[PDB]
């Protein structure tokens, strides 16, 4: 009756965007990015790759409610480093690592004879 | 009622392993555990999916059809 449609978990609704960035007034050079129609699958990956960066002072994410598929990611970097640049670098590193992993898995699977 | 298509927990397809299970139980006189292991059900989720099923559909089939063609 009140159960929402399952495609609402991954399909963007009308009038909303995937990302929205709002500055944080608690600390200098900090932003909060709301990701819509996403969950821990992307949030944990992005947070870990951000923490791998050396100029990122703070990086965390939270899913405020399991009912809704969205999460908030707070990023604070050192002076003179744009948090959006940190997000770009994290995403680029993730893509490169995943591409290398796909290549390695394909090469390893090509070596099988009992498949 | 009738054998479930997939294991509820993991999702392994078990709807094609019911007649084989019955044949193993009857023709080969295998016990339930060995028959389950033979069909490839190693996780106990699938094992409880196939082991505890009650085939009530046979009872339903005993009654004469309401609309017979």
């Amino acid at each position: 009756m009140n159960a929402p449609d399952r495609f609402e978990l991954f399909l963007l609704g009308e009038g909303e965007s995937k990302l929205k960035i709002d500055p944080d007034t608690k600390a200098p050079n900090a932003v909060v990015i709301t990701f819509e129609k996403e969950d821990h699958t992307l949030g944990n990956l992005i947070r870990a790759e951000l923490l791998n960066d050396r100029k990122v002072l703070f990086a965390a994410y939270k899913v405020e409610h399991p009912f809704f598929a969205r999460f908030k990611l707070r990023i604070q970097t050192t002076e003179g480093y744009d948090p959006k640049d940190a997000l770009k670098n994290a995403c680029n590193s993730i893509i490169n690592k995943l591409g290398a992993l796909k290549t390695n898995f394909e090469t390893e699977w090509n070596l099988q004879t009992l498949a | 009622m009738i054998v479930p298509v997939r294991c509820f927990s993991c999702g392994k397809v078990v709807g094609d392993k019911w007649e084989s299970y019955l044949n193993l139980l009857q023709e080969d006189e295998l016990d339930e555990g060995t028959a389950l292991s033979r069909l490839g059900l190693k996780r106990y989720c699938c094992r409880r999916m196939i082991l505890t099923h009650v085939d009530l559909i046979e009872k339903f089939l005993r009654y004469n059809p309401l609309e017979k063609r």
Partner: protein
């Protein structure tokens, strides 16, 4: 250079491998994507013409929706939500037809081998129900007494496990790391001795046991994940892993695209 993979066992429906030189978050994200985000074909709509059986119409519809279908070329199909047709067409769906009649004095078993593809697949490799057993009969869909009939049509659209678990191609995914608990990520419950009461995992043979006198290594991170992917049958298990990696990469690329475009 990057994440390194070594595979132990390869089968038609299982692949058991090691995923080394990689973060825990990446491995868990890959596992979650394999569970949920891989597109697959499955029957979505059922038009029932005749059902004189002992099962309810939606019961049979649910059973049909749980039938695994071939999805090797699922990437060539389009989602029904973003297709220009009215309800279903050939660019975004596959039409099957189940027509069974109980003309035998004994019970007649309606399997999934009786599902017949009607829509022209246009040379794709989708639609065929997956047959695994040696007998050749697929999933036992229904049973018929003499004189009972079951006529129905099915429309199959592509979907992912997030919308409904019937689209999940990945079954159970074994995922373990650090078999010797050298990272101390767990505190073992025990009564007398933790080592005796907890059986050693099969992966313990692939790592050096701790020396029991060395100090705790606080700088060590988590890597070398032992993962075993099982395939329902819709796509080969190696394709399951590859498409999971591809889908995760697509998600991150879409994040980059949205960031750049805004």
């Amino acid at each position: 250079e990057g994440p390194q993979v070594k595979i132990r066992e390869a089968s038609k429906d299982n692949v058991d491998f090691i995923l080394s030189n990689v973060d825990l978050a990446m491995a868990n994200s890959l596992r979650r994507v394999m569970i949920a985000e891989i597109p697959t074909l499955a029957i979505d709509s059922v038009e029932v013409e005749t059902n004189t059986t002992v099962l309810a119409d939606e019961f049979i519809a649910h059973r049909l929706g749980l039938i695994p279908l071939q999805s090797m070329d699922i990437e060539q199909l389009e989602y029904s939500r973003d297709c220009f047709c009215e309800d279903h067409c050939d660019k975004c769906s596959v039409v099957l037809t189940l027509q069974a009649f109980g003309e035998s004095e004994s019970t007649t078993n309606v399997y999934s081998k009786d599902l017949v593809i009607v829509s022209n697949l246009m040379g794709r490799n989708i639609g065929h129900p997956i047959i695994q057993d040696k007998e050749g009969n697929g999933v036992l869909i229904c049973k018929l007494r003499k004189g009972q009939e079951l006529k129905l049509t099915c429309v199959a659209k592509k979907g992912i496990a997030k919308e409904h678990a019937k689209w999940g191609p990945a079954a159970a995914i074994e995922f373990e790391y650090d078999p010797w608990n050298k990272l101390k990520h767990t505190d073992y419950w025990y009564e007398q001795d933790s080592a005796k009461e907890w059986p050693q995992s099969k992966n313990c043979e692939y790592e050096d046991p701790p020396n029991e006198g060395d100090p705790f290594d606080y700088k060590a991170q988590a890597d070398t994940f032992y993962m075993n992917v099982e395939s329902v049958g819709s796509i080969p298990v190696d394709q399951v892993v590859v498409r999971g990696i591809d889908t995760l990469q697509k998600k991150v690329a879409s994040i980059l695209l949205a960031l750049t475009q805004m």
